């Protein structure tokens, strides 16, 4: 497709999990999923895994080109040992343009058998004669 002038670039910082749900031997990572509710997943990315932690600090940054008014991002925390540790699902509007500060999002269950707790700390801001056919 041609470039879409309505797109913006969102900078997504996946900072930390806080108080995730004996030994507490979870190895958490985040699956970060840019999607369009009407057409499906566009891009899915996995952060690094942190070993044996209930308060993992990923401090990872991911940039997405998005349609602010249509696209959404789903954050899913998994135990790499995958077992579900909670989700955060956000719209991409309104967000400030780029300091601004993080938010501690409540993690939600996805099923009655889910038991999730704690928060996902995130920061999200916007950045400011002819061609031959391919054979």
């Amino acid at each position: 497709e041609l470039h879409n002038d309505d797109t913006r670039v969102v900078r997504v910082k996946v900072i930390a999990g806080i108080g995730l749900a004996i030994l507490g031997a979870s190895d958490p990572y985040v699956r970060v999923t840019l999607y369009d509710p009407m057409s499906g997943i566009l891009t899915s990315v996995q952060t690094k895994t942190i070993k044996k932690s209930l308060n993992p600090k990923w401090n990872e940054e991911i940039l997405f080109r998005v349609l602010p008014q249509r696209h959404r991002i789903l954050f899913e925390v998994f135990d790499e040992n995958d077992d579900f540790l909670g989700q955060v699902d956000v719209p991409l509007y309104p967000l400030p343009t780029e300091p601004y500060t993080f938010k501690d999002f409540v993690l939600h269950p996805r099923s009655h058998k889910s038991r999730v707790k704690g928060y996902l700390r995130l920061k999200m801001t916007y950045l400011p004669t002819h061609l031959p056919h391919p054979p």
Binding site: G40, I41, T43, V45, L63, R65, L131, P134
Partner: protein, 107 residues
């Protein structure tokens, strides 16, 4: 479809794509996508960095009837090649560098 995408070079060989990258300057982040010669459903990202040309196979997988693509064994998946290029223009991921300038197609 990526057939209208200026970075997509279609059915050219590995050798041809290296020749193109060299001829257009062997500059960091210079890249093109093309068909894979070893897999009719795969593509290849050909990318120059530090005067070296690397080829990354972009493999399909099907999740619930829909095809997604990945060059890093499923860690990073894309609904199509346009999403893939938009992403690696903004993020290095496993690549030696971000995608910067596409090679112009050659007749």
């Amino acid at each position: 479809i990526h057939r209208t995408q200026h970075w997509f070079h279609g059915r050219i060989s590995r050798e041809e794509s290296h020749r193109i990258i060299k001829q257009q300057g062997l500059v960091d982040g210079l890249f093109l996508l093309r068909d894979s010669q070893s897999n009719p459903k795969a593509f290849v990202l050909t990318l120059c960095h530090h005067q070296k040309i690397k080829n990354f196979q972009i493999l399909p997988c099907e999740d619930d009837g829909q095809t997604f693509f990945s060059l890093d064994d499923g860690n990073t998946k894309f609904s199509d090649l346009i999403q893939l290029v938009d992403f690696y223009q903004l993020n290095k991921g496993v690549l030696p560098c971000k995608l910067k300038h596409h090679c112009i197609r050659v007749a």
